[PDB]
């Protein structure tokens, strides 16, 4: 019973499955899409001291994954390598089909030790972790990811105006941390300036600031060979869907999606001569409309409850057939049988 939305004239309407509206026109499965929207566009804090407290350890619940077809550019991404004090790993190894998030600006790499009570790491809010068109519910070891939610959608008549054309450079930098007491309320972080110098980390610091400290220290600290790790401290002294439920919705959507087929014709269709695993995406921007995309951000927040309940019921390791089930149900609703030539149930009309 996962809700899905219908777009008409740049207006989003959450479609009622029992309403069996006749306004929406379906002609192929190319009109059914699923979109993954990041949480950072909703106004949440993204620094690692506060982005960690939303993550917990539990044992006794198996993990499930879903696939999504289109994504959104992420400003902040994470990468965990937590280990037990004994030396044993805390996070499961990534399966064969899992890869890191495609488009990231800053990668917050955290490595340290701490207690690990349960078997898997879960989101305390209910959202997902996105790994390159595969939305999971558990953190995997050593793979980049961004936390977000998934929405299901029907494009209007597929004019290629959505996710195929952009109405109107990739560079990611790695920031390395070091944590102790991970998973607890008594935890400490250190921004690793280099191999022997570290700076104490607080919540006020932004990724642009940290990269400034990396330079002002390296070009001046002169790094006297006193040997051992020295910890620096910044002078404490100065230095029909409504969205207003969310504190902030981004008026722009800068997306990426898989190749639109066709295109490459020269010799690039051959896998041997084709692009690598990261050169197959397309880019776009949809900033012209603001009411549409904020409405999308609320729809994904609304549908995450029914998506989680459906995943618990099923027994599939990976799920790919949500949209086909929706299409089969649509045909069975309206041309199911014995419909009247003049009736609300059966849409066929004379002349």
């Amino acid at each position, epitope marked *: 019973s996962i809700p899905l939305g219908v777009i008409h004239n740049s207006t989003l309407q959450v479609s009622d499955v029992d309403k069996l509206v006749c306004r929406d026109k379906l002609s192929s499965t190319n009109q059914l899409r699923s979109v993954g929207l990041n949480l950072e566009g909703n106004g949440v804090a993204t620094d690692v001291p506060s982005a960690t407290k939303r993550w917990g350890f539990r044992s006794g619940v198996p993990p499930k994954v879903v696939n999504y077809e289109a994504g959104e550019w992420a400003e902040n991404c994470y990468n965990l390598e937590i280990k037990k004090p004994d030396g044993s790993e805390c996070l499961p190894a990534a399966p064969d089909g899992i890869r890191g998030f495609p488009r990231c600006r800053y990668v917050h790499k955290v490595s340290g030790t701490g207690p690990c009570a349960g078997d898997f790491a879960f989101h305390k809010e209910g959202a997902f972790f996105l790994y390159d068109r595969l939305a999971s519910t558990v953190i995997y070891r050593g793979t980049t990811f961004a936390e977000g939610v998934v929405a299901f959608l029907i494009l209007p008549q597929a004019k290629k105006d959505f996710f195929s054309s952009h109405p109107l450079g990739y560079y990611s930098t790695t920031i390395r941390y070091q944590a102790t007491g991970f998973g607890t309320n008594e935890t400490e972080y250190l921004f690793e300036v280099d191999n022997l110098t570290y700076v104490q980390l607080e919540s006020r610091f932004t990724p642009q600031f940290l990269l400034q400290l990396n330079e*002002t220290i390296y070009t*001046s600290g002169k790094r006297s060979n006193t040997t051992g790790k020295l910890i620096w*401290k910044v*002078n404490p002294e100065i230095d029909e869907a409504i969205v207003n439920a969310q504190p902030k919705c981004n008026p722009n959507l800068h997306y990426w999606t898989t190749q639109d087929e066709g295109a490459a014709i020269g010799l690039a269709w051959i896998p041997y001569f084709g692009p690598a695993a990261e050169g197959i995406y397309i880019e776009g921007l949809m900033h012209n409309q603001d009411g549409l995309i904020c409405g999308l951000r609320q729809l994904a927040n609304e549908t995450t409850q029914a998506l989680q309940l459906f995943l618990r019921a099923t027994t599939e390791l990976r799920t790919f057939s949500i949209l086909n089930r929706k299409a089969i149900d649509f045909l069975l609703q309206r041309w199911g049988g014995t419909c009247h030539i003049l009736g609300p149930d059966c849409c066929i009309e004379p002349h």
Partner: nanobody
Amino acid sequence: QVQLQESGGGQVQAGGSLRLSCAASGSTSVIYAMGWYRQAPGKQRELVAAITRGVGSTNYADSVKGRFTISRDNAKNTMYLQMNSLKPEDTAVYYCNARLLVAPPPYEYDYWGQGTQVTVSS
């Protein structure tokens, strides 16, 4: 770790102009706000001028606004207070501070020079 050495102080007539300089070496880059403080005998230490490292904003006291100017050369690791229209009340020892931001485990912060005497004769 940023040794602050002032210069340019001495005796000077009232109504004239003078330039005070303050230099530092060692770290320099971590410096965040070079400034100016003054002490007359028997008085408390008071603000005179302040400049941010990136020339972000300059601040001057009301008793000195319109008469003092604080500047810097960046690629000399120096800072200048070019001042005009002296009065006898400015006769005091002038200090330059270099309050920086990060600092190593000694955690001292807010470095200080030894101070130079400026004497205004009327």
